[PDB]
Design a protein around this motif. Structure first.
Motif, PDB file in Angstrom:
ATOM      1  N   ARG B 298      26.812 121.230  20.482  1.00  0.00           N
ATOM      2  CA  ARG B 298      26.870 122.234  19.437  1.00  0.00           C
ATOM      3  C   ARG B 298      27.649 123.474  19.818  1.00  0.00           C
ATOM      4  N   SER B 299      28.685 123.309  20.628  1.00  0.00           N
ATOM      5  CA  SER B 299      29.491 124.451  21.044  1.00  0.00           C
ATOM      6  C   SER B 299      30.963 124.192  20.775  1.00  0.00           C
ATOM      7  N   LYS B 300      31.218 123.199  19.934  1.00  0.00           N
ATOM      8  CA  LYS B 300      32.570 122.809  19.585  1.00  0.00           C
ATOM      9  C   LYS B 300      32.629 122.375  18.128  1.00  0.00           C
ATOM     10  N   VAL B 301      33.766 122.618  17.498  1.00  0.00           N
ATOM     11  CA  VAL B 301      33.956 122.214  16.119  1.00  0.00           C
ATOM     12  C   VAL B 301      35.308 121.551  15.988  1.00  0.00           C
ATOM     13  N   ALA B 318      43.600 127.277  12.905  1.00  0.00           N
ATOM     14  CA  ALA B 318      42.212 127.636  13.215  1.00  0.00           C
ATOM     15  C   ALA B 318      42.034 129.102  13.609  1.00  0.00           C
ATOM     16  N   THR B 319      40.790 129.571  13.550  1.00  0.00           N
ATOM     17  CA  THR B 319      40.441 130.946  13.899  1.00  0.00           C
ATOM     18  C   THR B 319      38.933 130.995  14.153  1.00  0.00           C
ATOM     19  N   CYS B 320      38.547 131.240  15.403  1.00  0.00           N
ATOM     20  CA  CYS B 320      37.132 131.258  15.754  1.00  0.00           C
ATOM     21  C   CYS B 320      36.580 132.469  16.503  1.00  0.00           C
ATOM     22  N   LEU B 321      37.305 133.581  16.424  1.00  0.00           N
ATOM     23  CA  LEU B 321      36.887 134.831  17.050  1.00  0.00           C
ATOM     24  C   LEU B 321      37.490 136.065  16.382  1.00  0.00           C
ATOM     25  N   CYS B 332      37.400 124.283  17.907  1.00  0.00           N
ATOM     26  CA  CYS B 332      36.946 125.455  18.671  1.00  0.00           C
ATOM     27  C   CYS B 332      35.793 125.226  19.658  1.00  0.00           C
ATOM     28  N   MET B 333      35.858 125.918  20.788  1.00  0.00           N
ATOM     29  CA  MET B 333      34.837 125.798  21.812  1.00  0.00           C
ATOM     30  C   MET B 333      34.308 127.166  22.217  1.00  0.00           C
ATOM     31  N   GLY B 334      33.206 127.161  22.962  1.00  0.00           N
ATOM     32  CA  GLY B 334      32.592 128.394  23.429  1.00  0.00           C
ATOM     33  C   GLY B 334      31.709 129.093  22.408  1.00  0.00           C
ATOM     34  N   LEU B 335      31.210 128.335  21.435  1.00  0.00           N
ATOM     35  CA  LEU B 335      30.367 128.878  20.372  1.00  0.00           C
ATOM     36  C   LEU B 335      28.880 128.698  20.639  1.00  0.00           C
TER      37      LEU B 335
END
Ligand SMILES: *[C@@H]1O[C@H](CO)[C@@H](O[C@@H]2O[C@H](CO)[C@@H](O)[C@H](O)[C@H]2NC(C)=O)[C@H](O)[C@H]1NC(C)=O
Ligand SMILES: *[C@@H]1O[C@H](CO)[C@@H](O[C@@H]2O[C@H](CO)[C@@H](O)[C@H](O)[C@H]2NC(C)=O)[C@H](O)[C@H]1NC(C)=O
Ligand SMILES: *[C@@H]1O[C@H](CO)[C@@H](O[C@@H]2O[C@H](CO)[C@@H](O)[C@H](O)[C@H]2NC(C)=O)[C@H](O)[C@H]1NC(C)=O
Ligand SMILES: *[C@@H]1O[C@H](CO)[C@@H](O[C@@H]2O[C@H](CO)[C@@H](O)[C@H](O)[C@H]2NC(C)=O)[C@H](O)[C@H]1NC(C)=O
Ligand SMILES: *[C@@H]1O[C@H](CO)[C@@H](O[C@H]2O[C@H](CO)[C@@H](O)[C@H](O)[C@H]2NC(C)=O)[C@H](O)[C@H]1NC(C)=O
Ligand SMILES: *[C@@H]1O[C@H](CO)[C@@H](O[C@H]2O[C@H](CO)[C@@H](O)[C@H](O)[C@H]2NC(C)=O)[C@H](O)[C@H]1NC(C)=O
Ligand SMILES: *[C@@H]1O[C@H](CO)[C@@H](O[C@H]2O[C@H](CO)[C@@H](O)[C@H](O)[C@H]2NC(C)=O)[C@H](O)[C@H]1NC(C)=O
Ligand SMILES: *[C@@H]1O[C@H](CO)[C@@H](O)[C@H](O)[C@H]1NC(C)=O
Ligand SMILES: *[C@@H]1O[C@H](CO)[C@@H](O)[C@H](O)[C@H]1NC(C)=O
Ligand SMILES: *[C@@H]1O[C@H](CO)[C@@H](O)[C@H](O)[C@H]1NC(C)=O
Ligand SMILES: *[C@@H]1O[C@H](CO)[C@@H](O)[C@H](O)[C@H]1NC(C)=O
Ligand SMILES: [Ca+2]
Ligand SMILES: [Ca+2]
Ligand SMILES: [Ca+2]
Ligand SMILES: [Ca+2]
Ligand SMILES: [Ca+2]
Ligand SMILES: [Ca+2]
Lengths: 927, 539
Positions: B298-301, B318-321, B332-335
């Motif tokens: 659950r730390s990647k999409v 993409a955009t995750c931050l 995305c990772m590190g979530l």
């Protein structure tokens, strides 16, 4: 490239008997007719108590299709005692492997279970059977005395078999030792002349076999697939065997020699679990006698445009260089899930082009997992990666996938003709198929029109109906066609002539035939001999001026031609096929005399110039280059005007420049027909008179290196005119240059050491790193980035060392990565301090006494660097917690370099230099 | 004109950390639908968001190797299930739990043949009797009774085989395609823990045993719960395992013993989205292994496509931050569980073809919720037009997953991979597959190499001055968490002894000297031991 698929031989077998799991051609020297060998494991037999012992069927080519069994062994299970068989033949899978010399055939049963002579057991060692018309002998090279898995007990030899030139059966057992596997090659008339029906061992004389390897090598499955050919010096073939589980599921492919059985060359898959070795094959794919290895990895996963992994499989195709090394290439499958290199089967010449073909197979390809067979052809360049044909299976599915193409053989010619053949095996529908190769007719055409230039006011051939003398012009078409096998004597072609093809459905077709008016004449010829162009001519005229506008749009004549059937053998004719790379379209151009007056003919004045701008192509990288051409016709008309740009080897044409307004967008197009590379451009059919073109031609020259010094192109225009058809050739050399941006990056690891140092004792006489101080590590990297690579350079590093006879940053040693060597003018690590065992601030040489480390570099290509890794460690005497201000120091390190020599010689070199310093500040932080 | 439109149609909104959603039918992906009418050669843009909804129900299937070596294993695992729940409870309300057992195809060369008949039943040689050969047995479907797990397991008995490599890929497949038996919840986070100590049979290995029929990928179990085609159907290919894994949104975890670790990682490197965790000899380490993977899961999409007409092509940015974007990526990772991200896609057809509903989907790997996009097309010598290389005519219209004038360029980022996953090691930008390093004095395919780059003791400094001082950059760009993934901690006075990591030192804004240490071991460690109470100037 072309076999028959209209009507191939449909051989069948019983429901569930895996009929076709193994195939081969039987060609006894004792008879004139060849046959078909079809393995049939899982086939019930009339051997007492034996269920599915499998069999082998000999199938006759004689258009009858009756093909029943081969008398191998009819004896049920032998005994060691009363109610306890010695062997178990039920479900032995006899037939899984079937090879055959001539008159000699070896069939095996890889799942043949044996009770040991020792304790009660049922180990799968497998056996083979070698028949010879009359004499039939059992060949079980693994039924040795030694048993259990730690020996040859689960050997399952016969898993794969193969004969060598001088008769010497190579054989495999994937389970020998601990499934490491092993190869066994035994001479034929040793195997025969030693057979004693009363012994289960039989020491063989000149037996070649592999030994038990180390533990780590278990479950490799050597002998999973096997092929044989010469890869070492001259003489006998060598043992090629695929080990799908070698390494870490990577898979390898070993090649041992046919005399010592000592290991030679190895091959390795690039991806795990791909089964690199499931199948192999040795065949010369490029006519130069040096066996070429082909290795199948049916489960390989490549990358689709989308970037995701697809399971399609690849076929590693390694060519053998005469130097003993290889020039390997690769070839991926087409659909996903259809294994591709699942079954490689080299044929001979389905074209007889003087180069061997080969048929790779995807048993699960095509619609409904019916499997297809792509039949790649060979060329001297290597193997042509484009499936010249695809054998699509045609069997539904009854219990499981048909596996068409899972097993196939081809290299012997079963029928009359001089072209090979192919047997494919779809064991899911229990059948094998014969594909007969067809005769390959190569045919040269040739056509040309008599007066090429037409005079409207020409009176020579009276019209058909009336007698109105009109402007004549005749055109004759012709052609020769010689075969290379069973086919000749009546190569009959249906030819077609067409006038003014450039004329669409507009109908302004201003050229017709004599006795019949229309721009279309129909006709059929014939031929046979090699050099007998059987010809013919026709009278054609030109419509009157008062009935068509033109202004010169060449009256092109056209020729189409095609073969016809009933041009083949008695036993169901095999229609030939023209060679794929030969066009059934030829056409020449007829013009009308216009402006070519006074003297009556066109004599153009031609010229092409080039400015020679941007003259500079740095050695190494892709150098973009544009050529500004000035095509000019100063004389009279000039038909089929065209530019011939002769480019070098490392040339490569891109396109014509549109991005620039002031240029011409010529109909240029790169070409190589003869042993010459050249860009060809349409300079306007009738390039008028005084017409001036000035287009640009862009390229990208590739480096070579010491190509002397300059790359030239050769410009010349030409045309179909009778007089002055060309222009004085203009050459243009572009000069190669040298540029190598070398730089020197540097960096100290603990760039900043805070001096109050956590618990440190001042030792009288030190012995370890912990006794001296913290490590300080300077790193220096020389990196050539410029396109041009260099051949020799020098690295000078000045290190601190001492100061007022007091050490500072004591070096322990240094290390190198890349082409470089070094020397410290002083001994490094005098105090031999091994590991643990259990004048302001700047101190940068000139202020302190130097320890100079000099280094010799040599050969840093485009993107390679050389690195010096120095490992020192503060002596901590950077103390003096008293008198002035022992605060702030720098410990400077500095390293310069000089490029002294490059590979290129004839080009003007320039010395490349620079430097960099690396500080390590040891500060007093709390105070 | 004939305007191209992207009419959104259905759109429950992300269920802000509401896993147990009381009739809110839990949704993780923003617009559950949409529709675009593309005119010839025209594109259209549309956003897509996805969230890691807190308190999401987990489903975990325990598939363990039942070889003799798993004797000690089956001991300190009987107590599990219960032990498991307590940890997983602090992560989920509804936790399902199941079990499964495998060993290898009960047949000829793998099975203990049939030496004496006194063998089709045991481990005869060594007197220690055991169970016969099975391959894949399914005992205990996923249920609530986390205690009832302790039941079946204590009742589980070991077995033995000749061949070193077991036949697990077979199980891993059934325990996936067989949803009904296993009992996989639709709206739930599926997990499949794979425990073992030995190698494994891949596809085609089964030829020896006389099996030539390849794995069909279907569900093959009977009333008795034993894989029926085990003896009549070859091991599944690494690819078919993949195809099916994604399709049933099952998460494969590889809990294996160090002896065979490194091997199972490359198998992972080929089965994307797969997790590998170093298992123990005795296997007690198992839960602290499972509850670690969940985190990774659950730390990647990774956004995955499905179907999609060949004519239209999707481009992502993409955009995750904190709305800083990263053009090109679609994952995305590190979530942390609960965070939301967005993607922004772009359909585009090269000359509208013939009509039909043409409906394709879009969704993140592992999720059930997805963006169904139904497309429709409103549009009712030579050709120097190129230089080739996939480049068509007209004037050069590139193909899907191909860009640039010549159709030279790509849309692939896989090439620009890396070990740590991050695009171009985080020192360069992906340009037509190949990275182009924003050169800090570095090089390499993915800019991995940089011998001249500053020691980690200069990279981590910004981390302890953030997560432990609330200062410096990253505290300023709000990227202190997602970025400084590292798990710091204050060392009780002096620090570590283990000489397998580095110790630093530095001066903070406050002019004080911080001393810390960068370490990293067993299962991807990276603690940043910070000596508590830095040495500041006394007074
Ligand atoms: C060969 O004959 C046997 C028996 O007549 C067939 O099947 C064997 O016996 C029963 C009959 O249904 C099967 O259930 C078994 O599976 C077979 N024996 C064993 C040891 O498995 C078998 O189908 C026939 N084979 C062919 C190719 O027709
Ligand atoms: C090809 O591969 C094989 C196996 O990796 C190599 O053979 C091994 O070589 C070592 C070296 O001493 C031996 O101790 C092992 O017994 C061998 N193992 C096996 C299974 O044969 C071989 O040397 C490799 N290279 C070449 C050129 O053959
Ligand atoms: C005659 O016109 C040309 C000459 O070959 C044929 O058109 C295509 O030519 C290209 C050569 O660049 C081939 O690659 C194509 O395969 C040809 N088309 C086809 C359908 O094969 C054309 O076919 C010829 N037609 C006849 C009747 O001769
Ligand atoms: C060590 O200290 C020196 C100076 O004390 C640094 O070198 C330069 O020092 C001047 C001081 O006026 C600065 O303006 C420069 O910016 C410094 N250069 C750099 C690259 O920062 C030196 O940098 C210090 N060592 C390290 C590793 O930073
Ligand atoms: C030495 O290093 C590079 C060439 O690769 C150049 O360095 C100079 O160029 C820039 C000047 O602002 C900066 O990149 C550098 O800091 C600068 N260095 C110095 C000392 O001025 C420079 O052209 C090279 N010099 C030589 C003689 O090769
Ligand atoms: C494909 O991409 C390259 C990328 O630059 C382009 O060609 C370039 O070739 C060199 C690098 O390979 C550059 O230094 C040139 O400036 C550039 N040249 C041209 C004509 O663009 C180009 O888009 C493609 N390559 C070719 C040969 O067209
Ligand atoms: C820096 O790290 C090393 C370990 O990587 C520290 O050494 C530890 O272990 C040593 C022997 O194994 C002991 O001699 C040290 O006392 C121990 N460190 C501690 C804090 O207990 C080393 O000490 C570290 N540097 C400093 C100044 O403590
Ligand atoms: C065979 O002899 C040994 C290995 O048995 C080896 O040195 C030699 O090169 C091999 N080939 C020949 C021709 O002797
Ligand atoms: C008539 O035919 C051609 C074409 O018009 C013309 O050039 C020539 O004068 C005549 N033919 C011959 C053979 O002279
Ligand atoms: C798998 O990954 C390792 C990582 O070091 C590498 O050596 C190779 O790719 C594979 N090694 C093994 C043992 O499978
Ligand atoms: C990617 O760049 C931005 C990001 O939103 C935007 O223009 C679009 O999504 C992509 N580029 C193009 C040209 O569409
Ligand atoms: Ca030889
Ligand atoms: Ca060759
Ligand atoms: Ca050929
Ligand atoms: Ca033939
Ligand atoms: Ca004239
Ligand atoms: Ca254990």
């Amino acid at each position: 490239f072309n076999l028959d698929v209209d009507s191939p031989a449909e051989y069948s077998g019983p429901e569930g008997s895996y009929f076709g799991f193994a195939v081969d051609f039987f060609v006894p020297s004792a008879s004139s007719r060849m046959f078909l060998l079809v393995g049939a494991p899982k086939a019930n037999t009339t051997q007492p108590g034996i269920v599915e012992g499998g069999q082998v069927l000999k199938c006759d080519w004689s258009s009858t299709r009756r093909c029943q069994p081969i008398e191998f062994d009819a004896t049920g299970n032998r005994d060691y005692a009363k109610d306890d068989p010695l062997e178990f033949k039920s479900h032995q899978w006899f037939g899984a492997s079937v090879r055959s010399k001539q008159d000699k055939i070896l069939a095996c049963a890889p799942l043949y279970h044996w009770r040991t002579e020792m304790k009660q057991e049922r180990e799968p060692v497998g056996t083979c059977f070698l028949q010879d018309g009359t004499k039939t002998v059992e060949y079980a090279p693994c039924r040795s005395q030694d048993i259990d898995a730690d020996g040859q007990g689960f050997c399952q030899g016969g898993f794969s078999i193969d004969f060598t030139k001088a008769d010497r059966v190579l054989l495999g057992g994937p389970g020998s030792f601990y499934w490491q596997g092993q190869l066994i090659s035994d001479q034929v008339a040793e195997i025969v002349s030693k057979y004693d029906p009363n012994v289960y061992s039989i020491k063989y004389n000149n037996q070649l076999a592999t030994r038990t390897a180390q533990a780590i090598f278990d479950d490799s499955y050597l002998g999973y697939s096997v092929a044989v050919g010469d890869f070492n010096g001259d003489g006998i073939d060598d043992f090629v065997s695929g080990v799908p589980r070698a390494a870490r599921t990577l898979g390898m492919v070993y090649i041992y020699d046919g005399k010592n059985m000592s290991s030679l060359y190895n091959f390795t898959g690039e991806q795990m679990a791909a089964y690199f070795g499931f199948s192999v094959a040795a065949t010369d794919i490029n006519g130069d006698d040096y066996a070429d290895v082909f290795i199948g990895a049916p489960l390989f996963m490549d990358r689709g445009s989308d970037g995701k992994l697809q399971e399609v499989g690849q076929v590693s195709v390694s060519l053998q260089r005469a130097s003993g090394d290889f020039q390997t290439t690769k070839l991926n499958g087409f659909e996903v899930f259809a294994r591709f290199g699942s079954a490689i089967a080299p044929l001979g010449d389905l074209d007889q082009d003087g180069f061997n073909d080969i048929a790779i197979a995807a048993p699960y390809g095509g619609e409904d997992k019916k499997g297809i067979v792509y039949i790649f052809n060979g060329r001297s360049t290597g193997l042509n990666a484009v499936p010249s044909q695809i054998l699509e299976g045609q069997w539904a599915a009854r219990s499981m996938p048909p596996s068409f193409g899972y097993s196939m053989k081809g290299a012997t010619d079963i029928d009359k003709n001089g072209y090979p053949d192919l047997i494919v095996g779809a064991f899911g529908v229990d059948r094998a198929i014969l594909y007969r190769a067809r005769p390959v007719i190569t045919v040269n055409a040739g056509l040309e029109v008599y007066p090429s230039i037409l005079n409207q006011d020409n009176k020579t051939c009276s019209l058909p109906g009336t007698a109105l003398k009109v402007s004549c012009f005749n055109v004759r078409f012709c052609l020769k066609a010689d075969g290379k096998g069973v086919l000749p004597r009546k190569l009959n072609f249906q030819v077609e002539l067409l006038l003014d093809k450039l004329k669409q459905k507009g109908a302004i077709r201003r050229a017709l035939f004599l006795y019949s008016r229309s721009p279309s004449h129909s006709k059929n010829m014939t031929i046979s001999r090699g050099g007998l162009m059987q010809c013919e001519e026709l009278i054609a005229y030109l419509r009157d001026e008062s009935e068509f506008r033109d202004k010169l749009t060449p009256i092109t004549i056209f020729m189409e031609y095609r073969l016809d059937y009933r041009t083949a053998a008695d036993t169901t004719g095999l229609q030939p096929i023209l060679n794929q790379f030969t066009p059934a379209n030829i056409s020449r151009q007829a013009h009308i005399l216009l402006d070519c007056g006074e003297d009556n003919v066109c004599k153009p004045k031609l010229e092409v110039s080039v400015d020679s701008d941007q003259k500079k192509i740095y050695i190494g990288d892709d150098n973009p280059l544009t050529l500004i051409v000035k095509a000019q016709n100063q004389g009279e008309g000039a038909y089929e005007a065209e530019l011939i740009v002769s480019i070098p080897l490392q040339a490569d044409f891109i396109g014509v420049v549109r991005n620039n307004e002031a240029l011409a967008r010529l109909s240029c197009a790169f070409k190589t027909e003869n042993q010459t590379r050249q860009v060809v451009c349409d300079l306007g059919n009738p390039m008028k008179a005084g017409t001036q073109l000035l287009a640009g031609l862009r390229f990208s020259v590739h480096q070579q290196s010491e190509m002397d010094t300059s790359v030239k192109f050769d410009l010349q225009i030409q045309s179909s005119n009778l007089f002055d058809k060309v222009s004085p050739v203009v050459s243009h050399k572009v000069d190669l240059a040298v540029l190598a941006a070398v730089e020197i990056r540097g960096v100290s690891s603990p760039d900043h050491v805070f001096l109050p140092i956590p618990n440190w004792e001042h030792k009288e006489n030190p012995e370890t790193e912990e006794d001296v101080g913290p490590v300080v590590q300077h790193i220096y990297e020389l990196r050539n980035n410029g396109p041009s690579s260099f051949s020799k350079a020098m690295l000078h590093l000045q290190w601190p060392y001492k100061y007022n006879n007091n050490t500072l940053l004591y070096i322990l040693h240094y290390d190198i990565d890349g082409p470089m060597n070094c020397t410290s003018d002083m001994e490094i690590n005098p105090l031999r301090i091994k590991i643990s065992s259990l004048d302001i601030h700047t101190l940068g040489c000139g202020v302190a006494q130097c320890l100079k480390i000099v280094c010799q570099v040599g050969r840093l290509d485009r993107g390679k660097s050389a690195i010096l890794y120095v490992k020192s460690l503060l002596w901590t005497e950077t103390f003096m917690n008293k008198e002035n201000q022992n605060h702030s120091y720098s410990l400077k390190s500095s390293a310069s370099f000089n490029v002294i020599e490059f590979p290129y010689k004839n080009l003007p070199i320039e010395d490349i230099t620079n430097s960099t310093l690396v500080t390590t500040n040891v500060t007093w932080g709390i105070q | 004109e004939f305007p191209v439109s992207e009419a959104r149609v259905l759109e429950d909104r992300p269920l802000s950390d509401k896993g147990s959603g009381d009739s809110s039918q839990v949704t993780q992906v923003s617009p559950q639908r949409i529709a675009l009418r593309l005119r010839p050669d025209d594109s259209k843009n549309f956003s897509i968001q996805v969230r890691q909804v807190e308190d999401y129900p987990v489903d975990i299937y325990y598939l363990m190797d039942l070889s003799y070596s798993m004797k000690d294993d089956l001991w300190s695992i009987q107590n599990l299930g219960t032990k498991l729940a307590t940890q997983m409870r602090k992560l989920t309300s509804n936790l399902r739990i199941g079990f499964g057992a495998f060993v290898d195809k009960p047949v000829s060369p793998y099975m203990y043949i049939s030496p004496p008949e006194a063998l089709e039943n045991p481990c005869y040689d060594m007197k220690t009797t055991c169970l016969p050969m099975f391959g894949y047995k399914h005992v205990l479907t996923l249920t609530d009774q986390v205690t009832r797990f302790n039941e079946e397991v204590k009742k589980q008995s070991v077995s033995r085989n000749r061949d070193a490599p077991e036949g697990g890929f077979d199980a891993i497949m059934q325990a996936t395609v067989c949803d009904e038996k296993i009992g996989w919840r639709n709206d739930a986070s599926h997990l499949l823990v794979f425990t073992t100590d030995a190698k494994t049979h891949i596809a085609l290995d089964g030829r020896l045993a006389g099996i030539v029929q390849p794995n069909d990928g279907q569900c093959h179990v009977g009333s008795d719960n034993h894989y029926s085609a085990s003896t009549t159907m070859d091991y599944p290919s690494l690819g078919l395992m993949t195809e099916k894994l994604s399709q049933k949104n099952i998460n494969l975890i590889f809990a294996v013993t160090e002896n065979v670790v490194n091997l199972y990682q490359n198998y992972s490197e080929l089965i994307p989205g797969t997790t590998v965790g170093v298992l123990s000899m005795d296997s007690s380490n198992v839960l602290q292994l499972i509850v670690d993977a969940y985190g990774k899961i659950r730390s990647k999409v990774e956004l995955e496509v499905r179907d999609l007409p060949e004519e239209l092509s999707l481009s992502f940015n993409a955009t995750c931050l904190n709305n800083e974007v990263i053009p090109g990526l679609k994952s995305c990772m590190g979530l942390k569980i609960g965070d939301t991200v967005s993607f922004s896609i772009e359909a585009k057809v090269r000359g509208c073809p013939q009509e039909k509903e043409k409906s394709f989907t879009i969704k993140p790997v592992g999720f059930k919720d997805s963006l169904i996009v139904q497309v429709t097309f409103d549009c009712d010598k030579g050709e120097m037009c190129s230089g080739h290389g996939q480049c068509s005519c007209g004037d050069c219209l590139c193909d899907s997953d191909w860009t640039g004038y010549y159709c030279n360029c790509t849309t692939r980022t896989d090439t620009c991979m890396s070990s740590n996953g991050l695009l171009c090691s985080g020192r360069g930008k992906c340009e037509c597959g190949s990275c182009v390093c924003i050169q800090p004095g570095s090089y390499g395919d993915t800019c991995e190499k940089c011998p001249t780059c500053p020691d980690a003791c200069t990279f981590k400094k910004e981390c302890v001055e953030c997560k432990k001082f609330d200062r410096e950059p990253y505290m300023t760009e709000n990227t202190c968490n997602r970025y400084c993934r590292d798990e710091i901690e204050s060392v009780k006075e002096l620090k570590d002894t283990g000489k397998d990591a580095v110790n630093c030192t530095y001066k903070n804004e406050d002019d004080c000297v911080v001393r810390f240490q960068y370490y990293e071991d067993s299962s991807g460690k990276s603690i940043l031991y910070v000596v508590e109470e830095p040495e500041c100037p006394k007074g």
